[PDB]
């Protein structure tokens, strides 16, 4: 089977705050949050991820 | 992530000062030890 | 460095990984091998829980001329970090079966790699002691008896083992034995008395080679070893003081109460008699009863 | 029997037990008493080697108490126990006396519903199949000898065969040596001038057998 | 040795998994029956050998 | 490369309820509020900057 | 040549042809309920009715059984070739004969077909050949330097088991010393076979080059 | 076929024992994601002097959960040192399950299989191990296409032929269509052997030890009083007990907890300690003076 | 065996369909073997 | 070995009554209804309220 999920909250997934070394609050650029730096060490183009319930 | 993460309960009744029971936020009662690097001076009743 | 690191826990894990070592490089006939001990240290307990090889070489025209590898070092840490931030650097175990003065050289290199005083672990795996498979020794500078001066030494603390969780599971579910002692029964209690009598003796008869070979054979007085034996005497029960006389009326007082209890099993066993006496009784009855019954069953076809 | 009690695994607790009956072979009367101790015992194993040792003891001169023993042991409930219980009472009861016995014909069948039996597992079915091979082995007019019964003299070729047929659960293919074992029942007349066999009636009390057809 | 094999026998059925308990609704023609598990839902599963 | 692992999908939601943050020498030993001797740590061995969740 | 003892196999030989009571019951029951595509089952089966048709030589198994045949695989097809050694017992003008087409060198289907046949020519020859004892020791010491081949392996294991049986109660240096070979290899069954019989070989020797060997 | 497919006897060593055990229960809640490392022979025997434990994932297990650099960097410098050895499977926790081998733990288990057909996945579970053998089990690929055929069993020669399993669940499922299972057995040598048994000089230390002797009369005293209790128990047993029936003496009169066995064991108990009490201190008083 | 009792909510015309069982979430089940699309009407309890 | 299984950690229940004399019924603290063997070494008498 496959489980029924249903989206609840939508994020996007950069902008989201997922890295969070040298980044600050809860949420970034709000489109970016990796791609303009890389102290994070990370980069990502990752987007629309969203949150089931 | 080699800490590894703990449940909480509380101690809802002294048994014994070897054994108590505790009230598990997760949900049933459960009776546990205590070790080493607890102490059991401060082990009361009712206590996080 | 650090101060407290008295008292020295060691795995089961680790006499059989050095086991390993030992004989996995075919270092044999006292061709040492140094590995690494790893654990949790800053603090009196001493855990060791994981050891393991490095590459090492030695020497038999001068032996304080050998290799040590330090660029393995550095890349085991960073492995192991991962597998359990439970392992640092605690020193070296050093495979035995005897501690050298050329360990006192090989020390300083790992004093230096760990901030603290690292553990030097003796790992005796020929086994030609009956008791210590292992020794822990910790090497710390102390100034020496005699005049002299300070001196780089290894002072042996306590090389328990009291075991992980994780290693108990594994060490009875392999073992099949009675085992050496556990102290259980009244029958492992009583080989056991009589193991520590020879215990008692065996360490007693080379301290009176000792005092022997200072008086005859110049080897040097250490007055620790005078003074202990001091202690021991001044902690010697003398017979004729209160203290010694008390024990004898204890003892009439404790085969008191076993006098006690040994008829208080008279009267279990002879419940036991009694219960066999009327069994046996009721087999009588049960046996005169069918011989009885085999007239009913051969008349029963006649009249049929 | 002191290194089956002292050693605790399960190959030398095993072989210790089988052992005895070979040592004693021609005192096959006594040796139910002393593994009666070994049967009761709470050590799978050790059951399982008490069953082979009883097979081997009793095969050729039989003895009543040793079928006795081992039919607890085709009941009970490990399964190697039991597989090992089949085998052996079909070596003690191979032709003998089955005239004077209806045990015969209830051991036989009680092989035939193992089989039939789905519920069983196939170490009692393995049990129950080769059981009923010894059996029947030869036509029906072979046995098991142990001993010529002509000289007193322990024959080589059972007592050695023996040995290789009892270990079979660590090499499936030990065990054809039982072959060895069979001698055939019969007295057979040979011509003394002619060496060929004569046709001659003789004068027999005899002997109905078809408790195992 | 009766004494031994019986606690190791206490002992063997504690390490063999729980059991339950519920009560049958209805009787199925497939060779099963339908049970309802008393803190839990329906299921139809097969029957003992010995019923 | 081993947090990166962690940080890739699908991960719990959940939400924080307090912080609770001790720091190392609370008695004179560890981070908890215990008894015992040593092993002074950040989180590790002992505890005491902790998030309930 | 009462002596020799092929007289006196032969005279047994008369009575096992004569006197059989083969009962297909028991060999239908067994085909049904003890399958072939199972490997144990098949195994139990093989031995049974082998010991069952033992000393009598009968093909009425091998076409009884046809279908049954085809479902071996693995050390079960090993199994089911010895077997038919003990069906062919005896009858020793006509012994070789009947293991002929699945001796190597003339079939070539399966590598257990080929070792287990030299397996089960060991068997009727046990104590009635001198010579065939030598036929068998060629492909021993053959085999002993090309003995990291798996296949090779397997007609290895079966010969060593043969020769064994041949040559128990001879003594032959010979053949010990071809075994020898085979064993200092460390071959993966063969040597196991191999060590089997030596014992067999020098049977009742007590001689301590054997035992320290 | 190509291979015998007979399913190997596992020796793994008492120093691997160890290890896999410890990373195991570390790790949980977490699965722990390690190779198994030592040498195979013969066609069933493998024998493992070590286990690695790679660093462990937040993937879980899958093939996207080797690391073949960490590998890699764990085999040099075993080769470095002369302790060289080489896969024949790898190694795995379930935090709080049974042991089977998922679909997901198959493809794993498939890496390893192209290098050798002899892999072992051996799944721990080290909250219900509280015996060494219990709850693990090592699982073996068959092959895919002796399965439609029918040759499946084929590891019931050249083993025990014995096989115990456990559950019901997930292991009935994946043993029919993918594994073969059969037990782990554990190896050792007799130099390991005293190293377990013995606990140095401070074990014989122990034995001539005497303890404070308000403890021992307090033994004494607490023993003594217990009897005189339940041996009134005991004297309403045997005043009865001329009634018909073994379960309604039981019932009635008591049998179930019964008054003479318990009473029997307590005073055994403590009659045992005191002869061990006088030896011990005879011995010390003739012994040290 | 066992079989997990469902409640058949609705029918996706494809050879699916959506349950809601007594275990906690929701499945996307298929209709599948001895069972027909018109065997079934939504609301009925089906096996599963 | 069994002295193992009875210390920690154990969860709490309630037993209710018997069915044999050596196979009762509890119901957890989890809300499940067990049915469990019966260790020896207890009441038997004083269990079964």
Same mark, same amino acid.
């Given at each position: 089977p496959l489980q029924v999920a249903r989206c609840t909250k939508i994020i996007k997934g950069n902008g989201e705050s997922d890295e969070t070394t040298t980044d600050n609050n809860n949420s970034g650029n709000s489109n970016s949050n990796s791609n303009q730096q890389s102290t994070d060490a990370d980069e990502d183009d990752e987007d629309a991820k969203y949150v089931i319930n | 992530l080699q800490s590894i993460g703990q449940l909480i309960g509380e101690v809802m009744k002294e048994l014994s000062e070897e054994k108590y029971i505790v009230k598990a936020s997760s949900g049933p009662r459960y009776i546990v030890g205590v070790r080493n690097s607890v102490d059991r001076s401060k082990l009361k009743k009712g206590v996080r | 460095m650090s101060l407290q690191h008295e008292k020295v826990t060691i795995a089961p894990l680790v006499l059989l990984s050095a086991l390993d070592h030992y004989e996995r490089t075919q270092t044999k006939e006292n061709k040492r091998c140094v590995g690494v001990i790893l654990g949790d240290a800053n603090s009196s307990t001493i855990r060791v829980t994981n050891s393991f090889a490095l590459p090492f070489e030695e020497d038999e025209k001068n032996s304080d001329v050998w290799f040590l590898d330090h660029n393995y070092i550095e890349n085991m840490n960073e492995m192991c970090k991962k597998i359990?931030? #439970?392992? #640092?650097?605690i020193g070296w175990y050093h495979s035995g079966p005897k501690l050298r003065a050329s360990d006192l050289k090989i020390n300083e290199l790992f004093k230096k790699y760990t901030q603290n005083n690292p553990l030097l672990l003796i790992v005796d795996v020929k086994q030609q002691g009956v008791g210590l498979p292992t020794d822990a020794y910790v090497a710390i500078e102390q100034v020496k008896d005699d005049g002299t001066s300070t001196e780089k030494t290894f002072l042996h603390l306590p090389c328990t083992i009291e075991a992980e969780e994780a290693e108990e599971i594994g060490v009875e579910h392999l073992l099949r034995d009675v085992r050496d002692q556990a102290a259980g029964g009244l029958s492992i209690r009583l080989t056991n008395q009589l193991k520590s009598l020879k215990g008692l003796q065996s360490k007693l008869k080379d301290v009176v080679e000792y005092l022997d070979k200072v008086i005859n054979k110049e080897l040097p007085i250490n007055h620790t070893i005078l003074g202990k034996l001091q202690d021991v005497f001044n902690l010697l029960p003398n017979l004729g003081t209160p203290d010694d006389d008390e024990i004898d009326v204890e003892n009439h007082d404790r085969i008191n109460i076993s006098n006690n209890l040994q008829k208080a099993l008279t009267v279990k066993t002879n419940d036991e008699l009694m219960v066999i006496y009327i069994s046996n009784l009721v087999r009588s009855i049960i046996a005169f009863d069918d011989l009885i019954e085999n007239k009913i069953q051969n008349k029963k076809i006649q009249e049929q | 029997l002191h290194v089956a009690v002292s050693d605790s695994n399960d190959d030398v607790r095993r072989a210790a037990v089988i052992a005895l009956g070979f040592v004693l072979l021609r005192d096959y009367t006594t040796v139910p008493r002393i593994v009666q101790l070994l049967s009761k015992s709470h050590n799978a194993h050790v059951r399982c080697g008490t069953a082979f040792a009883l097979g081997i003891a009793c095969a050729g001169k039989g003895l009543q108490s040793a079928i006795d023993v081992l039919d607890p042991l085709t009941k009970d409930p490990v399964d190697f126990v039991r597989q090992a219980a089949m085998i052996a009472l079909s070596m003690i009861l191979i032709?003998?006396?089955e005239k004077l016995n209806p045990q015969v014909a209830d051991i036989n069948k009680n092989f035939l519903s193992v089989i039939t039996n789905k519920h069983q597992e196939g170490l009692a079915k393995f049990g129950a199949c080769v059981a009923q091979g010894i059996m029947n082995a030869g036509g029906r007019n072979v046995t098991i000898q142990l001993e010529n019964a002509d000289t007193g003299t322990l024959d080589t070729k059972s007592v050695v065969g023996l040995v290789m047929f009892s270990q079979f659960w660590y090499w499936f293919p030990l065990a054809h040596f039982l072959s060895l074992s069979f001698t055939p029942t019969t007295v057979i007349g040979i011509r003394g001038s002619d060496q060929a066999i004569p046709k001659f009636q003789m004068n027999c009390y005899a002997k109905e057998d078809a408790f195992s057809y | 040795n009766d004494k031994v094999r019986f606690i190791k026998d206490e002992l063997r059925l504690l390490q063999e998994p729980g059991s339950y308990v519920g009560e049958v609704i209805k009787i199925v023609s497939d060779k099963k029956v339908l049970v309802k598990v008393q803190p839990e839902g329906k299921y139809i599963v097969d029957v003992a050998k010995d019923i | 490369e081993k947090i990166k692992n962690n940080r890739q999908l699908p991960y719990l939601v959940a939400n924080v309820v307090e912080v609770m943050d001790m720091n190392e020498i609370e008695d004179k030993e560890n981070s908890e509020s215990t008894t015992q001797g040593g092993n002074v740590n950040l989180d590790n061995t002992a505890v005491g900057k902790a998030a309930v969740v | 040549n009462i002596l020799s003892g092929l007289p006196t196999c032969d005279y047994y030989n008369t009575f096992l042809l004569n006197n059989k009571n083969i009962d297909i019951g028991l060999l239908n029951k067994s085909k049904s309920s003890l399958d072939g595509k199972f490997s144990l089952f098949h195994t139990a089966v093989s031995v049974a009715n082998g010991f069952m048709h033992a000393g009598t030589t009968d093909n009425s198994f091998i076409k009884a059984n046809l279908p049954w045949l085809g479902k071996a695989q693995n050390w079960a097809k090993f199994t089911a070739t010895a077997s038919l050694g003990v069906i062919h017992k005896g009858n020793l003008l006509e012994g070789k004969k009947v293991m002929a087409p699945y001796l190597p060198g003339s079939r070539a289907s399966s590598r257990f077909i080929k070792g287990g046949s030299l397996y089960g020519l060991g068997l009727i020859y046990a104590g009635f050949g001198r010579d065939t004892t030598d036929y068998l020791k060629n492909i021993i010491v053959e085999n002993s330097g090309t003995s990291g081949d798996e296949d090779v392996d397997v007609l290895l294991h079966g010969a060593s088991l043969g020769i064994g049986l041949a040559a128990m109660g001879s003594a032959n240096i010979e053949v010990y010393e071809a075994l020898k070979e085979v064993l200092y290899n460390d071959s993966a069954t063969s040597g196991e076979a191999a060590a089997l019989g030596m014992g067999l070989c020098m049977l009742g020797t007590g001689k301590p080059e054997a035992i320290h060997d | 076929t190509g291979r015998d497919d007979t399913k190997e006897t596992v020796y793994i060593s008492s120093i691997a024992l160890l290890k896999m055990l410890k990373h195991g229960r570390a790790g949980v809640p977490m699965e722990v994601m390690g190779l198994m490392l030592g040498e195979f022979v013969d066609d069933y025997t493998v024998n493992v002097v070590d286990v690695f434990a790679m660093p462990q994932s937040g993937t879980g297990v899958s093939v996207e959960a080797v690391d073949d650099v960490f590998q890699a960097k764990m085999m040099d410098m075993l080769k470095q040192t002369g302790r060289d050895q080489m896969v024949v499977g790898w190694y795995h926790s379930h935090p709080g399950f049974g042991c089977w081998l998922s679909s997901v733990d198959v493809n794993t288990q498939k890496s390893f299989e192209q290098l050798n057909s002899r892999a072992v996945a051996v799944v721990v579970d080290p909250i219900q191990s509280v015996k060494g053998k219990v709850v693990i089990d090592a699982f073996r690929l068959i092959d895919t296409g002796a399965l439609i055929n029918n040759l499946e069993p084929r590891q019931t020669t050249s083993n025990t032929g014995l096989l115990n399993k456990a559950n019901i669940q997930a292991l009935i499922h994946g043993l029919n269509r993918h594994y073969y299972s059969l037990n782990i057995d554990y190896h050792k040598t007799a130099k390991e052997t005293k190293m377990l048994m013995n606990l140095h000089k401070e074990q014989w230390q122990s034995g001539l030890k005497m303890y404070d002797y308000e403890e021992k009369e307090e033994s004494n005293l607490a023993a003594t009083k217990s009897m005189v209790k339940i041996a009134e128990q005991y004297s309403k047993r045997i005043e009865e007990e001329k009634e018909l029936t073994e379960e309604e003496l039981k019932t009635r009169y008591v049998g179930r907890q019964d008054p003479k066995k318990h009473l029997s064991e307590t005073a055994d108990e403590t009659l045992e300690n005191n002869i061990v009490s006088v030896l011990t201190a005879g011995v010390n008083s003739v012994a040290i003076k | 065996n066992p079989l997990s009792i469902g409640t058949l909510e609705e029918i996706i015309d494809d050879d699916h369909a959506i349950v809601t069982s007594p275990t906690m979430p929701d499945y996307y089940v298929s209709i599948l073997s001895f069972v027909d699309k018109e065997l079934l009407e939504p609301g009925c309890s089906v096996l599963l | 070995e069994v002295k193992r299984i009875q210390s920690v950690p154990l969860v709490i229940g309630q037993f209710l009554e018997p069915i044999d004399q050596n196979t009762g019924i509890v119901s957890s603290t989890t809300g499940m209804s067990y049915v469990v063997r019966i260790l020896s070494t207890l009441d038997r008498e004083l269990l079964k309220p």
């Open positions: - | - | 359990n931030a #439970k392992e #640092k650097l | 032709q003998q006396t | - | - | - | - | - | -």
